[PDB]
Amino acid sequence: LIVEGKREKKKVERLTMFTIAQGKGQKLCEIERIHFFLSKKKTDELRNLHKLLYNRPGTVSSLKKNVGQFSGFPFEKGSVQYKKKEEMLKKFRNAMLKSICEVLDLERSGVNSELVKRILNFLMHPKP
Amino acid sequence: LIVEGKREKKKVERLTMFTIAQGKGQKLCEIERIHFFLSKKKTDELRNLHKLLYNRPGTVSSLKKNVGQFSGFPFEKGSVQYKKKEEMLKKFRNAMLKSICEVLDLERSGVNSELVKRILNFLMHPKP
Amino acid sequence: KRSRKESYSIYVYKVLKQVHPDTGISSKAMGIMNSFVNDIFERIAGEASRLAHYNKRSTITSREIQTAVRLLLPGELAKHAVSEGTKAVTKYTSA
Amino acid sequence: SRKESYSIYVYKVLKQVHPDTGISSKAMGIMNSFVNDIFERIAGEASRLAHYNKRSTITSREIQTAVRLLLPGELAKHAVSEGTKAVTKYTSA
Amino acid sequence: PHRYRPGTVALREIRRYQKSTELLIRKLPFQRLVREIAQDFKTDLRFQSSAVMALQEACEAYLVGLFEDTNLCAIHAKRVTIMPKDIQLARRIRGERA
Amino acid sequence: PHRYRPGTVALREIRRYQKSTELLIRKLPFQRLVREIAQDFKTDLRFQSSAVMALQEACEAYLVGLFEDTNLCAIHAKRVTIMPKDIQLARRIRGERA
Amino acid sequence: ARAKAKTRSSRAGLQFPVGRVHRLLRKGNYSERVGAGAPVYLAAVLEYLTAEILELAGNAARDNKKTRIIPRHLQLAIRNDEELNKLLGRVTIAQGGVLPNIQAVLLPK
Amino acid sequence: ARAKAKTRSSRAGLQFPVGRVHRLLRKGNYSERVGAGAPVYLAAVLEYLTAEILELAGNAARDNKKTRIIPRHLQLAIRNDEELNKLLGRVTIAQGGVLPNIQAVLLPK
Amino acid sequence: KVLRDNIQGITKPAIRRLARRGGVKRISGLIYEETRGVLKVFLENVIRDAVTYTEHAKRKTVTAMDVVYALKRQGRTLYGFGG
Amino acid sequence: HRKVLRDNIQGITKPAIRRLARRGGVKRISGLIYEETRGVLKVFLENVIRDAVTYTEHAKRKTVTAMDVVYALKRQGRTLYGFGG
DNA sequence: ATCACGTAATATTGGCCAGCTAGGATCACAATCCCGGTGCCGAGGCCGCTCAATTGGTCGTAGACAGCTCTAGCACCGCTTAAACGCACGTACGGAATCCGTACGTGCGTTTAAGCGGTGCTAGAGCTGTCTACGACCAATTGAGCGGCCTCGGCACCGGGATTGTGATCCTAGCTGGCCAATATTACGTGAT
DNA sequence: ATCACGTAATATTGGCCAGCTAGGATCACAATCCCGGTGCCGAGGCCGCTCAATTGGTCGTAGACAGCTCTAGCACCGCTTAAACGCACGTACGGATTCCGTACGTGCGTTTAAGCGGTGCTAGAGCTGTCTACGACCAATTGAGCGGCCTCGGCACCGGGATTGTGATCCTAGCTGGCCAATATTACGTGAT
User: Which Cys pairs are S-S linked (chains A, B)?
Assistant: First the structure.
């Protein structure tokens, strides 16, 4: 019954309660063609693209500039991220895909699956 | 100390934890000029237009159908609602206002204050 | 041989037949009501003892019981309990 | 008339635990209320135990059980130890 | 072909297990648990049936009231699903210091 | 020239009134309130100063703990601000109901 | 030389046992001494509370078309009364169950 | 011829009063009869708890470089110890304030 | 005479202070009346129990020990007032 | 005669916790609720059974009775009726 | 005379220039911390004196202990399903992102009444003395309550119909995509440089 | 040989028909409900007994009551000043909306172990009797404890200096808006038909 020692002092446990991933290639703001298109384009269009790029829409203010800062996708062809972007692209209306091609200087003439492939190759390596 | 009736049972108090306002004018869907624009347009420019007509932006699918049924603004020139829309127009970027003019068949060549006045007059009485 | 235990069962039966003559009660419910009686008894008697101690008095009388009731039982319950207790004490003193 | 308290005993314990330290009247009133509260808790549990086991007597065993029930954790252990030691000493003399 | 939409069965189960009074934990496992716990306080123990049944009634009423408070906390958070944070909050408030 | 942004002076006041122990309700108003309440239970009553001081200490401690629980409920609702619903929840869980 | 026995409960117009309550008060070490009106008062209070509980429980049973009270009926009577639920708020009844209470926000629209 | 008297406290090696505790147990109406070791054991328990609190409070007071103990120091000791805060949970201490505890979410970023 | 409308002596800034001591940063405007009601309830109960203990002591004066017993009853034991 | 009974908390199964919740008015339940509830229950049971075994040893019994459990809960402030409370 | 088309005025848009805004760095000021110094008032000690603690003895009885009865707990077994588990799948939910409106925080100037001290009065707390009604106690008496036994009433459970809530399916309606026809772009042969 | 131009093959785009999705209404399935018959077992009644309740008398003392003191609660005034109040203003917060993914919910087939009933053993609850050690009680003792009084030191507060921190201001870089000039469009004059 007699504990020969000091008592341990316990403590009460109280109930406590925009990273641009830089990819491979060139920024969409440096590429003369794309930069000229964004200048001619508007905040509206980049709402769908900012969703496609960073999986979230963007502030009417920090939208066009952040999309221009997009320098590529740091992941490679066949990654889980590549497949997840390809499905997103397949889920976009053909008119949207044609608008995204026009913002990236890609040819708007083509089948849905080709517009998807040509946008997805460009978003890996944005080339002037 | 002595009462005269029966107990008055006291009941326990348990702790209990898209209207299109039709205005004065022709629907934007029945105006073939504007309707042809929306057909040529995509859910982005209409998204800017709706963040303006009903205060809150709509859904990709609804956005479209909702802008289609705008019957005009039911309020008159000088109302608190007219002033509150005029300020929301003054707070839009000049590229947006030019995109809204193009969705309403309005001339995109004017000073900010004129684009504001020409959109606001159209949104009272949408005329073919 | 001889085994004896006490409860309040028959008194609860009697009260029941006073208020609900054509109604009955099960054994489990009767045990619950027995526990309720014993609980409220212990509560009242403990409050009464503490009252007598606070006032340095050696006796528990109708006053201490009445105060313990008014303190433990809530609202109209306390008023009607005091009424019943006073009526019973009155009838008892008129022996 | 003279009122009772636990003050001097708390001052003795303190001097044994902090000979450099003192204590204010208000703190002493708090310690007095604490002592009286603990006393009432332990004695109530001891009486209740005796009654449950139909005993008329409160002994060191009842107090030790009430301590086990009320004081929590290593506190209970070191209180049982200190009480057993004190009872042993008292019995030796 | 018939399938119920999520929620409908849950509400039916709520109505059911509130209309009812039987114990909801199985008795054998709860008994084994009681004995497991008691082994750490004293060895070679024995339990009356009424004792285990009492522990069971008490632990079920306790968990039921806890889940009531937890549902209240959840609803407070504009949710419908209860989460561990809700339980920790209900306990921290009831005075159990979770 | 200088103007603190909302929430700064509040944290400062928090650190202040937590470093300290003085009663935060003015005495005379509390005393008048106590006498008002008591006058509904018995008339021509008298209060020792110690009794009023005890009632004040008790009330402040009670409301302080209530506001702790209320701030916890609020935070749980993803809200910095406390609202009456938070108090009602805290009390319903505490057992004070209402 | 001895009068006909008349129990204290009968002298008070009660059903609960006054003698037994006297005995329990004396054997509970509640007080060195116990007045004569104390057990009477206490038995009358217990009888009133018992009658209240049983009235409400029998009403509940009759609402379920039952002639026989069971623990659930007691739970209903208690939790539906403001005073009893306050008196017995820290109390658990075996096989009493709960009061049907689905929060509104869970019901569909 | 009368032996010199030493208090029951000395015989037990305590600073608390054993005679006072035996008197309160006798005058507290806890039981008809009271053993001899009961007040000794109880006084030793009270002495132990007092000493535990005074150790913690004196530590807290030295932290604030204060030599005298005040209610705030007792509150700090109690609430900062888990076992004491457990036993003294519902206990309210006048002029003892509360523990500095600001929830993180309220802090700026 | 008779005191009236003395609950309002528990003023907005006093409730604000109490909250701050409770760790509160932002406060609605309805919190003040809710708190006044909560406090009036608490005091009604404590003072009912205290006045009861008093009459039972045949006193016309409320003491601190009466208040201490009342709080102990509400389950809110208080130290430093003769406990 | 004597065998250790390990991993008996898991006998408080997911559907049983689900039932308890339903009796508490719960509609939707996370997946972590189950372990949190098992821990809560093990704590409650540890305390109640500690107090009951204490009352037992005090009574010089080796068997835990219903009165021991009732006194223990009554102590924890969770009075229970139906077992002789 | 009508139509087609070169040229000039008007209108629209790209380049240039200027203004505006967001982010980062710097500074000014203002709350917090440190350090003495100091007057104060409450802790800490001292003293004598009362009543609670103590020593000693005796005696009744609480409960420790042994012994016996027998209840109830425990271990084991074997079926018999009902519940639990694993898994597939899809939808409602939680979380995150965005935005807007305004409620609450902050600060200033004005008003209020808390606080503090001093003064005067008197209710009632607290104590003492008294005397007595009332509770404890004992012995004898006795009837209510407890246990055992029995025997039917309440209730659960089931099977057969009725109603209702929920989900799946069908119908009418709107929007978008693949296919087809018309037309623009590009490769190639021929002519010019 | 390279390049401009007309022709032919290849390719793109507008229109149309068809496919797909939304909303409302209809219909079938399942759950909930009700309603009568059955048996089953626990509720409720009866009876002998015993022990706990009642009765009547004696006695001591706990507490009601009266009287005095004096402590302390109340009331009231005036001054000071910090707190409360009221209002202006704007930031940060709460609420609403949208969207997206996936975590739960639901259904199904398989597994597993809970539940039930039955057998055997046995530890330990529960009761009784013996008796001793222990506690209660009283009388004399006495010394610890406590109230009153004094006196220094811990501390709370003031002023000065210093440090940390927050808010505001300033500078740098990028984007947006306006203005001006170049170029496309439209109207009139002129050439061809």
Answer: none
Q: Which residues contact I47 (CB under 8 A, 6 or more apart)?
A: F34, F37, F38, F41, F55, I70
**Cβ distance H71 to H95 under 8 Å?**
yes
* Length J85 CA → K143 C1' (Å): 30
**What is the topology classification, in CATH, of domain F1-98?**
Histone, subunit A (1.10.20)
Domain count, chain C: 1
Distance, in Å, from the CA atom of I78 to the CA atom of I72, rounded to the nearest integer, reads: 7
Provide, in whole angstroms, the distance separating residue A110's CA from nucleotide L14's C1': 16
Nearest to B15 by CA among C74, G104, I34: G104
- As a three-state string, the secondary structure of I15-27 is HHHHHHHHCCCEE
How were these coordinates obtained?
Answer: cryo-EM
Q: How far apart are the first and last CA of chain J?
A: 33
Is the distance from CB of C76 to CB of C84 less than 8 angstroms?
Answer: no
Q: Is the CB of G66 under 7 A from strand L?
A: no
J6-85 CATH pick, 1.10.3720.10, 3.90.480.20, 1.10.20.10, 3.40.50.2000: 1.10.20.10
Q: Chain I residues within 8 A (CB-CB) of chain D? A: 77-83
Q: Is strand K less than 7 A from the beta carbon of I61? A: yes
One CATH from 1.10.20.10, 3.30.1130.10, 1.20.1250.20, 1.10.1740.10 for I4-83: 1.10.20.10
Q: CA G66 → C1' L38, Å?
A: 19
Contact between G30 and C45 using a beta-carbon 8 Å cutoff: yes
Establish how many alpha carbons lie within 13 A of residue G75's alpha carbon, considering only the half-sphere containing its beta carbon. 22
- Cβ-contact I62, F54 below 8 angstroms: no
The residue in chain C having the minimum alpha-carbon distance to the alpha carbon of residue I51 is C71
Closest nt by CA–C1' to H22: K53
- The G-side interface with J (CB below 8 A) comprises 71, 90-95, 97-98, 101-103, 106
